Structure formats: C-alpha cells, structure tokens
C-alpha cells in the first residue's frame, strides 16, 4: 500500500526465488548441447513403465521441495494459518513447477533437461502417457515464446502460488491482500521494464489446472495397474500431493 513498499516487495520475491530455484539458469544453458544419443534414448524407451514413473516422480518431488522452500521465504506466506499454507501448496506447488520447468526447455530442438542431458518427448515413451507429455512440452514451448526474465518468473510464480480463489482457504481475505500486493509488484515491474505486452500473452488460469488434472488422471490409471509400486516406491510427498 505504497510505491516504495511495492518496489521493495519486488526485490524480496526476486530474492526468494534466486535462493530456491534448484538449477541455475547458466548451467541449464551450458548443457543445451549435451544431448542424449539415439542409443541412450532407446535405453530409456526400453525401461519398464514402472521404473520410469518412479524416476520421474522422484525428480518432480525434488523440484516440488524447492517450491515449498520458496513458499516459506515468500513475504507473507508464513504469516498465514497452517490450513491455508497447506491448501495453497497442495493446489499450486505443481503449477509452479510447470512454470519453472521452462528454464530447462529448449525451444530450438524441442528438448528438456533430464538426468544430466537434454531429450525430446520420445525420451518418455515408456511412461505410456503421450497426451500428458506433449501437453507439458507444448506448455513449456508457449512460455518460452515470452522470453521471461528470472525476475519475471519469480513474480509470476509467486502469483500462481498465492491464489485467493483456492477452495478450502479459511482466511480468504488475508490471501486476497497478499495476492493483491503481489499483483501490483509484478505489474509495476513490467511497467518499469516495458514488458506489459506479455500480460495478454500469459496462459489462461484454466491451463495450469488442466495440466495438473491430466497428471492426476494418468497417475490413477498407473496406480490402479500397479498399486504396490506406488505404495512402496513413490516418494511420500508425491503421494501426499497427488493421491
């Protein structure tokens, strides 16, 4: 509720993000030419479905952990009640990951960083869910067309997380105050850096809900054909969030 309070919110969010982003951008850019060879890709396509789901679920969980830590350092988050902190994270941890991951996607060759190197979606054929994979690559693609800055990613991912429309929130208005302050910080920064054109091009709020949904739907199909593998080999946190 003041121009410098807002300029200052921007820096703290940007700062929170740099401290919690898991992979440094430089490194992800270095590695772009470290591409998987055809033999390696075959190696992956010939791993069993369940070995491959388990690997993907561990990576996702590593990534989600950084998202929690981002939440904790977020100005305002910890001052909410523990019901709403949980609600917000259950809903949006993954959505945030869906945005973060575009730093690791290369639009020139349609690849994504995974286990050391870059690969295309044919890398993940063993999972048996190519509609989900290609929705994720198409999402990453469409974000890469906005050429985000890190500051822009910080501010926007803070807004994804801090959504006052989530069902289950008890202290709903305290989330609106926090949201609104972050709406402002973000919009101010785009105004300062001449980037308000990107607003019209951002994904519909629908789109992140949809991909989160496909994920849950394919999970259930998998779980139903491999109940014990989920029970015995899937990270607890993954199961907390997605079962």
């Amino acid at each position: 509720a003041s121009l410098t309070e807002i300029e200052h919110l921007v820096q703290s969010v940007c700062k929170s993000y740099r401290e919690t982003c898991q992979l440094r951008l430089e490194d992800l850019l270095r590695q772009r030419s470290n591409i998987f060879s055809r033999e390696e890709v075959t190696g992956y396509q010939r791993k069993s479905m369940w070995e491959m789901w388990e690997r993907c679920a561990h990576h996702l969980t590593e990534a989600i952990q950084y998202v929690v830590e981002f939440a904790k350092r977020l100005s305002g988050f910890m001052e909410l009640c523990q019901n709403d902190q949980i609600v917000l994270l259950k809903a949006g941890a993954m959505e945030v990951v869906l945005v973060r991951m575009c730093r690791a996607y290369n639009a020139d060759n349609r690849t994504v960083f995974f286990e050391g190197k870059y690969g295309g979606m044919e890398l993940f054929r063993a999972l048996g869910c190519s509609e989900l994979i290609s929705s994720i690559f198409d999402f990453s693609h469409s974000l890469s067309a906005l050429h985000f800055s890190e500051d822009e990613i910080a501010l926007y991912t803070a807004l994804v997380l801090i959504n006052a429309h989530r069902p289950g929130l008890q202290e709903k208005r305290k989330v609106e105050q926090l949201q609104y302050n972050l709406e402002l910080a973000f919009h101010h920064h785009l105004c300062k850096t001449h980037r308000q054109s990107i607003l019209a091009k951002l994904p519909p709020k629908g789109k992140l809900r949809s991909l989160c949904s496909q994920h849950v739907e394919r999970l259930q199909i998998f779980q139903h054909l491999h109940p014990i593998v989920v029970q015995a080999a899937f990270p607890p946190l993954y199961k907390e969030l997605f079962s």
Partner: peptide
C-alpha cells in the same frame, strides 16, 4: 503427514 513437517 509430510507437508506439515516440512513447514515447521
């Protein structure tokens, strides 16, 4: 269980 623990 898990998320509560990470938050405290």
């Amino acid at each position: 269980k898990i998320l509560h623990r990470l938050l405290q």
